[PDB]
RNA sequence: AUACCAAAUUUUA
RNA sequence: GAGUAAAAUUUGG
RNA sequence: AAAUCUUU
C-alpha cells in the first residue's frame, strides 16, 4: 500500500518519479571521517574482511608499458570519445539476463575533454596522470600502423598507405543515388534508412555497423532492400588518391564524395584527429567530399553554418574552398543540414555581426580573418608593449603563434593566425 | 608562503572556512543590499540594452526534462493549514511528488500544460489553482553555504518551491539554447580551463585584457530584466508567471517572512542573466559574473564600461583589473600565448579523511597537477611519498589496523611506500588498485556510505532492470510495476539466472576482441 | 513516438484478443503490453498480422518506418487506412467523441497573461542609479600595505604572550608532569568531574565579543603536526588528557549548568575548551609540585575543531616550498629583521593559518594574486580589498589577517615585482 | 523562427 | 541545515 | 568561561 502513500491521489506516475522515489536516502555524519572510521572499529573490521575475503577475488589489471616521447606544449583539451553500446547489442545483452539499467547506461556515446600540456610526435592520447611520462593509450601488421597515420613511412601500393587500389583487408562504404553500398572484398551489401533505422539485409556486417555509427541510426534487418546499379566492383578495382590526414573519430578516411574506407583491425582513432596544426589541412581534404561529421563545433551547428555562409558570400576562391571544407568537417552526415555553401540561403543576421567566429574542437577561428588570408598567408602581429620582457625569445623570421621580442622595433609582440602554425608547409 | 610564490597561487592548499553561524545575518544582508539597489543608490538594476535581435523560441514545443525535477538536494514546501503559511525543508523529489499529488497530474509536463490551458486563475487544477501556485512559489527558505575559500563570512543560499523549480527549468533550458544560437563563442557548457583557452584565443588580437568580475550580481538582476529577456526570446506566459513570482518573492528567516522585491536570490537564473549581457553585444566572453573582454584604446574601454552598465553587469572595482601579459577567467590564468601560467594555480591540499581516501585524493590531485605543467613528475612522486609518511604517522595505530603484511601501506601496518608512477601504471599489489584515482571505491568510502545508509519504514516495489529502450516518461501503476517485475523474473528463470549479473562496460569490451 | 497519441492508442486496443486469449494489439505506450527487448516502429503492434500501426493527422507525417501502416485520421468525418480491417476497427472504436489535443508551445499565451502583466506593472520598479566614474591607476605600492598593517596595529595592538600559538613549542615537562599540570589546572578552575572526565559548566554569558589583539610570533613551531593531530583526536575524547610524543592537551566539553538535571554527556553541537601547555613566562603561568607551565585555552565549536584537526602541515609546507622564493628573517611582529630575525617564524605563521578557521589568509592570498597579475586597477577600490578586518572576529583570525598582510608587505619589500 | 539517471569526491561561478 | 549552474572521476541502478 | 544570540 506504499504506492497509495507516496503518490496519494494518483494511480499512475512516470518511471522517472518512481525510480527517484526508490533511491536510498543517506544521512550525513556529524563527526569527522576519522572518528566515523574509528567508531566500533568499523574500519578495522572492514580492512580485516577485505584482506580475508575480497582481496583474493580481485582480478589483476594489466600494467601499462607503452611510452612515447613528449614535450612541453600549450594547454590543450585532449578529447576522448568512448562509443557506447549499439541498440542491437544492448537488446541482446538484456535478453541474455544482464542488468537492464547498467546496459542502458552504456548505451550512450561519451565525449570528454582533459586539460593536458604535453604533445607527442604523433599527437597520441595519454593516460591519466602520465602525460608527462608519455604513456599512451595506443598500443604498437605494418599496414594497420600505416592506415592510422597521416603520412605513412612505408607505402604498400594500396589505398591504405598511399595512392592505389583496395587491399584485401580494406572495406569501403559509398553512397550511390539513395542507397549506401558497403563492399568488403568478399561480401557486398546495400543499406537504406527508413525513418530512424538503417535498413540492410544483414545489419551484423561490420561495414553496416560502421555506417550506422557514422549516420547515428539504429541498425535494422530488412530483406526487401536492393539497388539497381552497383558500380562498386569498378571502384573497388580502381585507384584513388589518399588524403594525408589522421583518421576521423569514426575510424575511417574519405576517398571520394560520400565514400569512406575502413580497416578491420582499426576500431577507433587513437590520436586526436583535429588539432591546431592540422585543422586547415583536414578542411582542404574534404573540400568537395560532402558532410563528414568529424569535428565537433561549439554552440549550434546551424549558427556555425550561417556564419560560414556569410563569410562565403565575400571572399576569393581559396577562402571559399577553405570555408566549404570547414562546413563539410562540422556538418553531420545525412542529417537535415545544408552544408553546401551554394544552395544554403544567405542569412542577413549573420552578416549583421561585425566579426564571424566559429569554435571547432576548442580552436577559435575568425572567419573574417580567413577571408582576408590570415591563417594561411600572413600572421597577425599585435604589439603588447614597447619594453623587453624577461624570459621571452627573439622573434624568428617566420614566427609561429606565441609571444616574442622584436629588436627591429624593440617591442613585445603576440603573433597569432601564423601560417607557420596553421599551414606549416613542411 | 603563498605571498612568496614565484608564480600564480590562489592559496587553495588549506581547506575552506567553516561556520556554525545561523543563516539569518547573511540572508538579511543580501536582502538589504537588494533593497538598496532597488531604491537606486549604489548599483544599477535597470536594463537599457537592446534585446530585439534575440531569436524567438515561442514556436518551439514545450518539453520538460523530468530528470531535472528530481534529486536529493533540498527544496522548500509550503503548506497553508489555518490561514498561515508554513515553509518546511524537504528533498526535491518529495516536494515535486507533493506538488504532483496536490494537483492531479501524472507528469510535470502535463502539469505545465494544464496550468497554461486554464481559463481563470481561480480555476481548480486539483486541490489548488494557478493563483495558489503563484502565491506559494514565491516563498524561499534561507540556508548557509560555507567551505568556500576566500570568504570568511559564508554566503546565503535559498531553497525554492517545486513549482518555481519547474518553471525555472523550462526558462533556463531555452535561455541556454538561445545562448548557443547567439553567443560569439559558446561557453555555457565549457569547463573553466576550456573557457580560459577559448578566451586566450579570442583576445589575442588586442593589446589590453580586462580581467573582469561583477559585484552584487544576483541582487542587481531585477525581475524586469528577466522578463525583458524572456519576452525577447519568447517564453510567453511562463516568463510572465516566473517574473511575477520573482518580484513577489519572500524569504523565511528564522520565523519571519521578509519581502525581497529586488534581485533573483543568488544564481536562480544564470543563463538568463548571462543572456542579459550576451544579447546586447558580442564583445564579451562570459558566463554569469565573469568576463574576459579585451580592448585596444581608452575609448574602447569606455564603450565596454557603458555596455556593462547598460546590461546591469556592474563592474566589480575591487576585483576587476587590466593585464597585458596574462588573462584570467574562472580562476584559470593563462599567458597570452595560451600556455598555462607557471605556479600552483588552483592546486589544493588534501585534508586527512581516512587512511586510503586521503591517498586516493592526493593521487588524483597530483595526477591533475602533472597532466598540466604545474609541477614535474619527480616533485609529484616525492610529494606522494611524503603524504604516505604523514598518513603512516596519523593512522598506524591499533584502532585502525592490526596487520603486518609487507604489501600493505605503512599506515596500515605494512612496509610498502609505493611510487606514484608505479601506482598510476597499475604496477602494484591488487590492494593498491583502490588508491588509484580511477580505481574502485576504497574501504573507507564503503564504510562511510554503509554508516550513512544504516541510519533510519516501508519501500516501494523495486522497478529495476528495465528494457534499455523503454523511455522513462511512460506511466506505471502499482499493478504495472508488479507485472513488469514478474515478467522479468520469469524471463530470468527461463535463462536459469538469479538476480541479474552486473554488467561492466570495461570488462565486456575487454572480452569483445 | 508521441505521448499525445498514447491515450488514443489505448482506445484502439480495446480488449481485442487472438489465439484464444492472447492480446492482439500491444500499445507502445504501455509499460505492461510492450514486448521487452523489441525496438518500437509504430504506435502499436498487431501480433496476429505481425505489423505496426501508427496514427497520423492530415498532412502531418510522423517519423516511422514505411512498413508501419498509417491510419490517417481525416479531420472532416472519417479515417482512411490502407488496410480495411484497421479502418473498420477505428470506425468502431473512435465512434465516441475523442480528439487529439494540440501541441502546447513554449511561447503559449494564457488567458490570465494580461492580468498578471498588469499586476507586475503595478508593483515596484527599480530606479536607474548612478553610473560610476572609473579611474584606472597603478596597483597599490608598499606604502599602502604598510598603512593597512599600521592601522590594524594601532586599532588593536598586541598581546604580551603568544597564547595558544606558544603551544607549538615544547613546554619543558615530561608526560607525567604534563598530565599532572593539566589535571591540576582543570581542578583549580573548578571544572566539574564526572565519569572520569572534566566538564566546564556555564550559566550566563555577557553576549559580547572577547578582546581582540594580535598574537606575537613564537620563534618556531616544531610541534605543529603533533598539535593539530591532538586537536583532531580531542574532537570526541573530551574530558581526559591526551598525549603525543612531546606535548599534550585537554579538551573540556562546555555544557550548560541546570543545577540538578544538567547535561551529563556532550552532543554533536557542544563546544570544547582546548587547553594546552607552553613554556612559562607570561600571565597564564601555572605551578604545581615544582612544575611550571603556561596553560593556554581556546574555545572552539565542533566544526572549527574538525576543520583545524584535518589540515596537513607537512604536505602544505612542502607544496609551498616547491616554487617558493627565499624567506626572510622576521621578528615577533612580522617585521623584517636581518640582524635578529628568525626564518623558522614562517612555520609559525603557517600554523596560525591552520588554527584560523575563517581562513582570511585565503582572501588575502587571492587579492594578492590579483595584485601581482594586474597592470591597472580601479582607483581607491582595489586598495580597499585588503581591508578585511570587518569580515572577521577573534584573536586568531585577526592575527592571521595581520600576518598575511605582513607577508604581503615583506614580499614587496625583499622581492619586488 | 525552427531544425543517459542518481549518489559520492575535486574544482569552477 | 546546507540551494542554482558547469566540468571531470568513481559506485550503483 | 570564550574565536560570545552559540556552547539547547
Ligand atoms: N556558491 C556560489 C557562488 C556563486 N554563485 C553565483 O555567482 C555569483 C557571483 O558570485 P560572487 O561570489 O562573486 N558574489 P557577488 O554577489 O558577485 O559579489 P562579489 O563579486 O563577491 O563582491 C553569485 O551572486 C551567484 O549568482 C552561486 O550561485 N553559488
Ligand atoms: Mg563577483
Ligand atoms: Mg574574472
Ligand atoms: Zn597498406
Ligand atoms: Zn555496391
Ligand atoms: Zn600566556
Amino acid at each position: 500500500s506504499q504506492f497509495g502513500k507516496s503518490f496519494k491521489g494518483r494511480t499512475e506516475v512516470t518511471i522517472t518519479e518512481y525510480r527517484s522515489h526508490t533511491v536510498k536516502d543517506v544521512h550525513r555524519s556529524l563527526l569527522t571521517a576519522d572518528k566515523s572510521l574509528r567508531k566500533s572499529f568499523c574500519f578495522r573490521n572492514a580492512l580485516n574482511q577485505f584482506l580475508d575475503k575480497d582481496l583474493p577475488l580481485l582480478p589483476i589489471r594489466p600494467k601499462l608499458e607503452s611510452r612515447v616521447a613528449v614535450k612541453k606544449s600549450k594547454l590543450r583539451s585532449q578529447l576522448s570519445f568512448r562509443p557506447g553500446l549499439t541498440q542491437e547489442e544492448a537488446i541482446d545483452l538484456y535478453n541474455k539476463g544482464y542488468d537492464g539499467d547498467s546496459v542502458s547506461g552504456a548505451l550512450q556515446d561519451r565525449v570528454v575533454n582533459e586539460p593536458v600540456a604535453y604533445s607527442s610526435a604523433d599527437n597520441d592520447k595519454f593516460h591519466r596522470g602520465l602525460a608527462a611520462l608519455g604513456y599512451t593509450l595506443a598500443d604498437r601488421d605494418t599496414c594497420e600502423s600505416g592506415f592510422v597515420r597521416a603520412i605513412p613511412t612505408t607505402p604498400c601500393g594500396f589505398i591504405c598507405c598511399g595512392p592505389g587500389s583496395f587491399k584485401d583487408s580494406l572495406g569501403f562504404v559509398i553512397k550511390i543515388g539513395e542507397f549506401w553500398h558497403m563492399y568488403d572484398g568478399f561480401q557486398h551489401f546495400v543499406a537504406v534508412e527508413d525513418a530512424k533505422f538503417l535498413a540492410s539485409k544483414s545489419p551484423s556486417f561490420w561495414l553496416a555497423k560502421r555506417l550506422a555509427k557514422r549516420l547515428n541510426l539504429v541498425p535494422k534487418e530488412d530483406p526487401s532492400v536492393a539497388a539497381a546499379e552497383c558500380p562498386c566492383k569498378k571502384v573497388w578495382e580502381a585507384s584513388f588518391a589518399r588524403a594525408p590526414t589522421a583518421l576521423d573519430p569514426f575510424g575511417g578516411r574519405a576517398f571520394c564524395d560520400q565514400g569512406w574506407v575502413y580497416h578491420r583491425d582499426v576500431g577507433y582513432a587513437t590520436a586526436n584527429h583535429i588539432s591546431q596544426e592540422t585543422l586547415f589541412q583536414q578542411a582542404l581534404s574534404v573540400r568537395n567530399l560532402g558532410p563528414q561529421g568529424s569535428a565537433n563545433v561549439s554552440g549550434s551547428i546551424h549558427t556555425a553554418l550561417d556564419r560560414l555562409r556569410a563569410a562565403y558570400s565575400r571572399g576569393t576562391p581559396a577562402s571559399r574552398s577553405i570555408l566549404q571544407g570547414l562546413a563539410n568537417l562540422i556538418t553531420p552526415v545525412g542529417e537535415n543540414f545544408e552544408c553546401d555553401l551554394d544552395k544554403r540561403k544567405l542569412n542577413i543576421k549573420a552578416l549583421r555581426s561585425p566579426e564571424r567566429y566559429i569554435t571547432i574542437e576548442g580552436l577559435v577561428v575568425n572567419l573574417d580573418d580567413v577571408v582576408r588570408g590570415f591563417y594561411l598567408d600572413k600572421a597577425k602581429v599585435t604589439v603588447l608593449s614597447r619594453s623587453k620582457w624577461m624570459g621571452y625569445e627573439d622573434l624568428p623570421q617566420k614566427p609561429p603563434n606565441g609571444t616574442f621580442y622584436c629588436r627591429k622595433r624593440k617591442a613585445m609582440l603576440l603573433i597569432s593566425c601564423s601560417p607557420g602554425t596553421y599551414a606549416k608547409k613542411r | 608562503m603563498w605571498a612568496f610564490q614565484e608564480g600564480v597561487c590562489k592559496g587553495n592548499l588549506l581547506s575552506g572556512p567553516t561556520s556554525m553561524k545561523a543563516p539569518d545575518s547573511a540572508a538579511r544582508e543580501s536582502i538589504d543590499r537588494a533593497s538598496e539597489i532597488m531604491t537606486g543608490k549604489s548599483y544599477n538594476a535597470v536594463h537599457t540594452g537592446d534585446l530585439s535581435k534575440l531569436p524567438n523560441q515561442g514556436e518551439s514545443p514545450l518539453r520538460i526534462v523530468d530528470s531535472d525535477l528530481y534529486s536529493e538536494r533540498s527544496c522548500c514546501w509550503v503548506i497553508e493549514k489555518e490561514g498561515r503559511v508554513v515553509c518546511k525543508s524537504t528533498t526535491l523529489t518529495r516536494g515535486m511528488t507533493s506538488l504532483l499529488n496536490t494537483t492531479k497530474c501524472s507528469s510535470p509536463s502535463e502539469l505545465i500544460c494544464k496550468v497554461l490551458t486554464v481559463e481563470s486563475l481561480s480555476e481548480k487544477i486539483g486541490d489548488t489553482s494557478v493563483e495558489e501556485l503563484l502565491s506559494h512559489g514565491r516563498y524561499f527558505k534561507c540556508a548557509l553555504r560555507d567551505q568556500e575559500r576566500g570568504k570568511p563570512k559564508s554566503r546565503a543560499i535559498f531553497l525554492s518551491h517545486p513549482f518555481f523549480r519547474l518553471l525555472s527549468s523550462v526558462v533556463e533550458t531555452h535561455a541556454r539554447s538561445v545562448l548557443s544560437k547567439v553567443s560569439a563563442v559558446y561557453t555555457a557548457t565549457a569547463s573553466a580551463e576550456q573557457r580560459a583557452m577559448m578566451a586566450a584565443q579570442v583576445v589575442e588580437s588586442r593589446k589590453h585584457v580586462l580581467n573582469g568580475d561583477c559585484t552584487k550580481y544576483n541582487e542587481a538582476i531585477d525581475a524586469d530584466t528577466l522578463l525583458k529577456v524572456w519576452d525577447a526570446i519568447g517564453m510567453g506566459s511562463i516568463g510572465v508567471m516566473l517574473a511575477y513570482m520573482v518580484r513577489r518573492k519572500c524569504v523565511l528567516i528564522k520565523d519571519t517572512l521578509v519581502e525581497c522585491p529586488g534581485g533573483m536570490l543568488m544564481g536562480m537564473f544564470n543563463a538568463t542573466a548571462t543572456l542579459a549581457l550576451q544579447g546586447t553585444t558580442d564583445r564579451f566572453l562570459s558566463f554569469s559574473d565573469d568576463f574576459i573582454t579585451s580592448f585596444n584604446s581608452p575609448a574602447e574601454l569606455r564603450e565596454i564600461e557603458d555596455l556593462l552598465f547598460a546590461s546591469c553587469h556592474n563592474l566589480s572595482l575591487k576585483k576587476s583589473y587590466i593585464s597585458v601579459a596574462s588573462l584570467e577567467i574562472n580562476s584559470c590564468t593563462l599567458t597570452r600565448d595560451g600556455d598555462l601560467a607557471t605556479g600552483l594555480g588552483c592546486t589544493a591540499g588534501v585534508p586527512f579523511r581516512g587512511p586510503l581516501v586521503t591517498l586516493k585524493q592526493t593521487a588524483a590531485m597530483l595526477s591533475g597537477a602533472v597532466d598540466s605543467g604545474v609541477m614535474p613528475f619527480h616533485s609529484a612522486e616525492r610529494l606522494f611519498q611524503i603524504k604516505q609518511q604523514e598518513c603512516a604517522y596519523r593512522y598506524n595505530n591499533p584502532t585502525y589496523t592490526t596487520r603486518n603484511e609487507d604489501f600493505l601501506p605503512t599506515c596500515l601496518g605494512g612496509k610498502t611506500v609505493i611510487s606514484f608512477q608505479s601506482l598510476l601504471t597499475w604496477d602494484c599489489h591488487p590492494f593498491w588498485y583502490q588508491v588509484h584515482p580511477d580505481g574502485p571505491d576504497t574501504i573507507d568510502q564503503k564504510v562511510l556510505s554503509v554508516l550513512a545508509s544504516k541510519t533510519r519504514r516501508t519501500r516501494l516495489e523495486a522497478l529495476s532492470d528495465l528494457d534499455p529502450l523503454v523511455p522513462h516518461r511512460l506511466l506505471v501503476s502499482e499493478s504495472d510495476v508488479s507485472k513488469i517485475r514478474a515478467a522479468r523474473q520469469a524471463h530470468l528463470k527461463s535463462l536459469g539466472l538469479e538476480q541479474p549479473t552486473n554488467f561492466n562496460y570495461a570488462i565486456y569490451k575487454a572480452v569483445q576482441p | 513516438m508521441d505521448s499525445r497519441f498514447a491515450q488514443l492508442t489505448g482506445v484502439f486496443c480495446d480488449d481485442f484478443t487472438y489465439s484464444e486469449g492472447s492480446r492482439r494489439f500491444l500499445s507502445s505506450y504501455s509499460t505492461v503490453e510492450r514486448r521487452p527487448g523489441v525496438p518500437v516502429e509504430g504506435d502499436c503492434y498487431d501480433c496476429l498480422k505481425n505489423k505496426w500501426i501508427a496514427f497520423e493527422l492530415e498532412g502531418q507525417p510522423r517519423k516511422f518506418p514505411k512498413a508501419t501502416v498509417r491510419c490517417i485520421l481525416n479531420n472532416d468525418a472519417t479515417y482512411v487506412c490502407s488496410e480495411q480491417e484497421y479502418q473498420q476497427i477505428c470506425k468502431v472504436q473512435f465512434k465516441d467523441y475523442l480528439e487529439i489535443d494540440g501541441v502546447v508551445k513554449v511561447g503559449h499565451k494564457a488567458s490570465y497573461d494580461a492580468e498578471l502583466r498588469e499586476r507586475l506593472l503595478e508593483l515596484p520598479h527599480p530606479k536607474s542609479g548612478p553610473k560610476p566614474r572609473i579611474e584606472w591607476v597603478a596597483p597599490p605600492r608598499l606604502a599602502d600595505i604598510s598603512k593597512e598593517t599600521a592601522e590594524l596595529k594601532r586599532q588593536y595592538g598586541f598581546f604580551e604572550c603568544s597564547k595558544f600559538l606558544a603551544c607549538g613549542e615544547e613546554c619543558g615537562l615530561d608526560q607525567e608532569a604534563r598530565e599532572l599540570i593539566l589535571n591540576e589546572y582543570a581542578r583549580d578552575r573548578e571544572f566539574e568531574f564526572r565519569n572520569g572526565g572534566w566538564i566546564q559548566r556555564y550559566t550566563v554569558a555577557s553576549h559580547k565579543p572577547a578582546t581582540q589583539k594580535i598574537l606575537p610570533l613564537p620563534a618556531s613551531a616544531p610541534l605543529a603536526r603533533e598539535l593539530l593531530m591532538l586537536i583532531a583526536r580531542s574532537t570526541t575524547q573530551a574530558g581526559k588528557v591526551l598525549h603525543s610524543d612531546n606535548t599534550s592537551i585537554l579538551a573540556v566539553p562546555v555544557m550548560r549548568d541546570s543545577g540538578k538535571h544538567s547535561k551529563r554527556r556532550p552532543t554533536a553541537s557542544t563546544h570544547h575548551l582546548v587547553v594546552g601547555l607552553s613554556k612559562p613566562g607570561c600571565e597564564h603561568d601555572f605551578e604545581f609540585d615544582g612544575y611550571r607551565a603556561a596553560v593556554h585555552v581556546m574555545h572552539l565549536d565542533p566544526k572549527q575543531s574538525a576543520n583545524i584537526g584535518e589540515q596537513d602541515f607537512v604536505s602544505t609546507r612542502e607544496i609551498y616550498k616547491l616554487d617558493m622564493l627565499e624567506l626572510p628573517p622576521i621578528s615577533r611582529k612580522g617585521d623584517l629583521d636581518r640582524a635578529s630575525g628568525l626564518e623558522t617564524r614562517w612555520d609559525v605563521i603557517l600554523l596560525l593559518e591552520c588554527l584560523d578557521s575563517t581562513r582570511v589568509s585565503q582572501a588575502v592570498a587571492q587579492h594578492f594574486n590579483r595584485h601581482r597579475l594586474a597592470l591597472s586597477v580601479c582607483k581607491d577600490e582595489f586598495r580597499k580589498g585588503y581591508q578585511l578586518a570587518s569580515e572577521i572576529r577573534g584573536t586568531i583570525p585577526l592575527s592571521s589577517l595581520y600576518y598575511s598582510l605582513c607577508a604581503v608587505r615583506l614580499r614587496m619589500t625583499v622581492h619586488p615585482f
Side-chain angles (χ1 to χ4, degrees), chain A residues 176 181 188 190 230 232:
Chain A
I176 300 113
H181 298 227
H188 164 274
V190 159
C230 170
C232 272

Side-chain angles (χ1 to χ4, degrees), chain A residues 19 28 82 101-102 105 111-112 114 128:
Chain A
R19 302 282 305 284
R28 221 182 209 184
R82 344 186 182 176
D101 295 329
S102 312
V111 168
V112 299
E114 273 322 80
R128 176 158 183 197

Side-chain angles (χ1 to χ4, degrees), chain A residues 304-319:
Chain A
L305 287 163
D306 293 337
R307 314 223 176 118
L308 282 159
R309 174 80 192 83
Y312 181 103
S313 328
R314 68 213 222 170
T316 65
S319 74

Side-chain angles (χ1 to χ4, degrees), chain B residues 148 151 155 213-218 266-267 288-289 319:
Chain B
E148 291 202 87
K151 290 203 78 109
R155 81 173 56 237
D213 200 67
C214 307
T215 183
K216 315 283 143 55
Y217 188 67
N218 68 86
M266 176 87 54
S288 187
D289 81 326
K319 307 193 172 188

Side-chain angles (χ1 to χ4, degrees), chain B residues 501-512:
Chain B
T501 51
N502 51 325
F503 163 77
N504 319 102
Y505 198 6
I507 297 136
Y508 161 90
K509 187 180 178 183
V511 181
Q512 181 61 59

Side-chain angles (χ1 to χ4, degrees), chain C residues 104-378:
Chain C
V104 177
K105 292 161 174 212
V106 65
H108 182 87
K109 191 230 58 180
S111 64
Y112 50 79
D113 179 271
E115 139 172 26
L116 286 180
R117 267 179 199 289
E118 262 281 11
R119 287 210 207 161
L120 211 51
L121 164 152
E122 297 305 325
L123 283 167
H125 300 273
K127 312 212 183 354
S128 204
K131 190 181 208 312
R133 165 73 290 121
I134 301 153
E135 272 200 24
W136 295 98
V137 303
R141 18 172 176 98
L142 177 57
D144 309 25
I145 316 310
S146 305
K147 290 181 128 202
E148 183 60 71
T149 44
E151 163 71 11
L152 268 180
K153 156 155 34 56
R154 181 209 71 73
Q155 174 165 21
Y156 298 106
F158 273 86
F159 274 122
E160 283 313 89
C161 72
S162 300
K163 289 170 105 105
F164 201 86
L165 218 49
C167 298
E169 262 157 345
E170 249 196 328
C171 77
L173 289 177
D174 51 296
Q175 195 187 313
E176 325 309 14
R178 285 197 313 271
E179 164 150 331
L180 180 86
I181 281 283
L182 275 169
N183 278 307
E184 291 305 325
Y185 172 90
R187 198 191 323 289
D188 173 275
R189 255 69 197 163
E190 305 273 41
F191 291 175
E192 166 176 335
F193 191 56
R194 200 201 290 221
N195 294 20
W198 290 106
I199 290 160
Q200 168 165 73
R201 295 282 182 191
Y202 65 89
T203 54
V204 86
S206 46
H207 295 312
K208 85 198 253 213
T211 291
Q212 309 168 38
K213 250 176 270 204
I214 303 158
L215 291 167
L217 292 177
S220 49
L223 312 177
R225 171 177 90 209
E226 266 186 52
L227 192 69
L228 299 170
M229 168 87 252
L230 272 168
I231 282 160
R233 281 158 58 189
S234 70
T235 39
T236 56
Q237 292 179 273
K240 296 167 206 112
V241 171
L242 286 191
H243 291 296
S244 86
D245 277 350
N246 298 285
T247 190
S248 50
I249 58 164
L250 162 62
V252 185
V254 190
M255 316 209 253
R256 179 172 286 289
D257 198 9
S258 299
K260 180 122 183 57
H261 304 308
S262 323
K263 218 156 159 177
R264 333 170 299 110
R265 294 186 39 187
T267 191
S269 73
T270 301
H271 290 197
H272 286 351
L273 185 79
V274 188
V275 189
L277 300 178
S278 36
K279 273 231 188 43
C282 69
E283 77 216 299
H284 314 93
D285 278 17
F286 187 79
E287 180 155 31
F288 196 91
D289 287 1
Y291 305 112
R292 300 201 59 144
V295 190
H296 291 128
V297 304
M298 200 171 42
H299 191 108
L300 309 166
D301 57 52
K303 287 236 204 81
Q304 286 170 318
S305 288
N307 212 19
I308 298 154
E310 282 181 346
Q311 307 311 294
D312 186 0
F313 185 88
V314 181
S315 292
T316 300
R317 191 167 61 184
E318 302 297 295
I319 297 162
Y320 274 138
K321 192 173 335 173
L322 268 179
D323 192 54
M324 215 183 39
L325 294 164
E326 188 176 327
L327 287 169
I330 51 173
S331 73
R332 263 169 83 251
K333 311 206 171 195
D335 280 26
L336 180 62
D337 219 347
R338 299 283 194 187
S340 50
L342 295 162
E343 291 104 50
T344 47
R345 249 153 197 144
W346 285 99
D347 283 326
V348 188
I349 286 163
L350 186 56
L351 175 60
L352 181 53
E353 293 170 347
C354 299
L355 290 169
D356 178 26
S357 183
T358 77
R359 307 275 147 77
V360 70
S361 73
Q362 271 158 6
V364 181
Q366 286 166 22
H367 199 53
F368 190 54
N369 195 43
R370 282 189 287 272
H371 183 180
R372 285 197 296 130
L373 282 158
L375 180 84
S376 289
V377 305
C378 303

Side-chain angles (χ1 to χ4, degrees), chain A residues 327-377:
Chain A
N328 293 344
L329 228 59
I330 65 176
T331 305
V333 196
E335 279 232 36
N336 189 94
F337 292 101
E338 176 73 290
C339 82
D340 187 356
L341 310 172
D342 287 298
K343 346 187 296 188
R344 204 194 170 74
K345 309 318 199 273
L346 173 56
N347 197 358
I348 295 158
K349 283 179 179 179
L351 273 169
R352 291 289 313 289
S353 302
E355 287 72 297
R356 250 80 79 202
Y357 277 105
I358 51 158
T359 315
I360 306 158
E361 296 268 26
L363 303 173
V364 180
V365 180
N366 185 194
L367 304 176
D368 222 29
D369 303 4
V370 170
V371 159
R372 55 184 82 151
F374 258 121
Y375 293 79
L376 308 166
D377 261 349

Side-chain angles (χ1 to χ4, degrees), chain B residues 68-75 90-97 160-162 165:
Chain B
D68 288 338
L69 304 177
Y70 303 97
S71 56
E72 293 296 284
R73 265 79 73 110
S74 274
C75 85
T90 186
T91 51
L92 182 56
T93 286
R94 291 193 128 99
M96 196 56 59
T97 292
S160 48
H161 197 261
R165 286 258 63 69

